[PDB]
């Protein structure tokens, strides 16, 4: 998890200068981040993609779109990868009111 967190951070800091160069909130700002425990450890990287948007939201100030869950692993250049156990994930998120 520490590994995936670091690489996700670097990808975030890279994407922002790639996309919106003037903003620099993330290059210079101590930032605590909190990921609650509970994911099965082998599945633990699967949440990575969410972080990368989390941070980006804070870096632009727009709250995310309503009730829109997401998952999946990310790489340093942003090539998302398959994740297992989709069935449990779908059945659990269905009843939370998520729609997209």
């Amino acid at each position: 998890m520490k590994e995936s967190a670091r690489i996700a951070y670097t990808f975030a800091r890279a994407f922002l200068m790639q996309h919106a160069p003037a903003n620099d909130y993330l290059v210079t700002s101590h930032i605590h981040l909190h990921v609650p425990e509970g994911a099965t450890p082998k599945d633990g990287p699967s949440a990575g993609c969410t972080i990368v948007t989390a941070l980006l939201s804070l870096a632009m100030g727009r709250p995310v779109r309503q009730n829109l869950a997401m998952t999946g692993e990310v790489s340093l250049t942003g090539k998302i990868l398959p994740v297992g156990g989709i069935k449990e994930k779908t059945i659990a998120a269905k009843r939370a009111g998520v729609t997209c």
């Binding site: 590994e3 670091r6 690489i7 670097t10 890279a14 200068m17 620099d24 290059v27 340093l76 250049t77």
Partner: protein, 50 residues
Amino acid sequence: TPPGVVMGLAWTAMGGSTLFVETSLRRPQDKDAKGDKDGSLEVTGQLGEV
């Protein structure tokens, strides 16, 4: 991808495999062109010490 990857063969425990090594910039490069504080690496991938 043109900037920062190269396919790398590796002798995984079962068969061969084609891992990609990936590298990227970490901070704006030229905040002070005239300074002298060498750019540290941060390596990842759960490498062993060797």
